[PDB]
Design an enzyme around this catalytic site. Structure first.
Site, PDB file in Angstrom:
ATOM      1  N   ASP A 182      54.351  30.116  48.901  1.00  0.00           N
ATOM      2  CA  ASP A 182      53.287  30.770  50.136  1.00  0.00           C
ATOM      3  C   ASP A 182      52.088  30.748  49.301  1.00  0.00           C
ATOM      4  OD1 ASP A 182      51.915  32.486  51.716  1.00  0.00           O
ATOM      5  OD2 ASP A 182      54.020  32.835  52.708  1.00  0.00           O
ATOM      6  N   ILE A 183      51.149  30.360  49.859  1.00  0.00           N
ATOM      7  CA  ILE A 183      49.616  30.565  49.331  1.00  0.00           C
ATOM      8  C   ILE A 183      49.390  31.992  49.252  1.00  0.00           C
ATOM      9  CG2 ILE A 183      48.806  28.119  49.453  1.00  0.00           C
ATOM     10  CD1 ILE A 183      46.700  29.472  51.762  1.00  0.00           C
ATOM     11  N   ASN A 215      61.198  36.069  59.817  1.00  0.00           N
ATOM     12  CA  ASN A 215      60.326  36.785  61.031  1.00  0.00           C
ATOM     13  C   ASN A 215      60.349  35.767  62.089  1.00  0.00           C
ATOM     14  OD1 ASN A 215      59.513  38.747  59.194  1.00  0.00           O
ATOM     15  ND2 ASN A 215      57.700  37.526  58.480  1.00  0.00           N
ATOM     16  N   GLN A 253      56.233  37.156  62.892  1.00  0.00           N
ATOM     17  CA  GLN A 253      55.777  35.709  62.657  1.00  0.00           C
ATOM     18  C   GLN A 253      54.598  35.342  63.195  1.00  0.00           C
ATOM     19  OE1 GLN A 253      58.520  33.246  65.217  1.00  0.00           O
ATOM     20  NE2 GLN A 253      58.500  31.427  63.654  1.00  0.00           N
ATOM     21  N   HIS A 285      61.185  29.594  58.845  1.00  0.00           N
ATOM     22  CA  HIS A 285      61.021  29.456  57.395  1.00  0.00           C
ATOM     23  C   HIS A 285      61.651  30.707  56.752  1.00  0.00           C
ATOM     24  CE1 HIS A 285      57.465  31.005  58.869  1.00  0.00           C
ATOM     25  NE2 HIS A 285      56.867  31.711  57.568  1.00  0.00           N
ATOM     26  N   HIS A 344      61.525  33.292  53.764  1.00  0.00           N
ATOM     27  CA  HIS A 344      60.591  33.654  52.571  1.00  0.00           C
ATOM     28  C   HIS A 344      61.617  34.013  51.307  1.00  0.00           C
ATOM     29  CE1 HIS A 344      56.597  34.467  54.602  1.00  0.00           C
ATOM     30  NE2 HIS A 344      57.236  34.604  55.600  1.00  0.00           N
TER      31      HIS A 344
END
Ligand SMILES: [Zn+2]
Ligand SMILES: [Zn+2]
Lengths: 143, 142
Positions: free
Chosen positions: B32-33, B88, B95, B101, B103
């Protein structure tokens, strides 16, 4: 440190402790979290004692997650929440209090919910080069 | 929200770059950036499903089957003190990208950019209330 014989979730599975059951099959048990951070807050656990995420086999992980959408949909259909979260805590320092892997299924109703994520990005602490090295470091370790 | 406008579908299709951690026929994992913590990774299905409610049992199993090995790699490399999984669904639940997805969030200590607000309501429910809530859910599971 955290054996099946001293585990309260294994006691629930074995019927020595009562639970409010939501779903059960050969591999997993789902029951309400008595805290009810939000109404309908549910736990999904494997029947086999695994302490946390790092101890799950692929098969156990598959069995656990394969029932989550149907349980989430049941909660959704009955209580009409505005949103939904899944949460898993591993390690005392990450909030784990019962050392038997479990997923929290948390419906959200709005502003007055008992669950919320405190979230802060640290994006600019990393360059492109940094991310590439973090990603390959993890990639090379994946078994 | 549509699949042609979905950022994650673009990444899967190679129209956008990502820092890849793992990929197989069914799933893609990448950093995740935001990096709320060092090694914060997303695991996503290659098929576009908006959220938890749209996953099939088959897709849900493909996603989660690889989570422990990715979590283990992150743990082996960075020695975090703990670890969280978060998902989420719905803008009111946090979200922002509308492709399912998970995390994977390693935890190291006080500078962590993830934390949970957790408020128990245990004493507002009787045993009867819990039994009725559970039965209502149990009977609705398809
Ligand atoms: Zn146990
Ligand atoms: Zn998508």
């Amino acid at each position: 440190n955290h054996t099946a014989d001293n585990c309260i979730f294994c006691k629930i599975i074995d019927g020595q402790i009562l639970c409010s059951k939501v779903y059960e099959d050969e591999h997993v048990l789902a029951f309400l979290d008595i805290s009810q951070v939000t109404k309908g807050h549910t736990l999904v656990i494997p029947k086999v004692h695994k302490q946390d995420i790092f101890a799950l086999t692929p098969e156990i992980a598959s069995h656990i997650f394969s029932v989550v959408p149907k349980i989430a949909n049941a909660i959704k259909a009955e209580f009409n929440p505005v949103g939904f979260n899944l949460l898993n805590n591993n390690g005392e320092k990450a909030g784990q209090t019962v050392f038997h892997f479990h997923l929290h299924l948390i419906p959200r109703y709005g502003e007055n919910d008992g669950f919320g994520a405190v979230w802060k990005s640290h994006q600019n602490e990393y360059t492109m080069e940094n991310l590439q090295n973090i990603a390959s470091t993890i990639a090379n370790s994946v078994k």
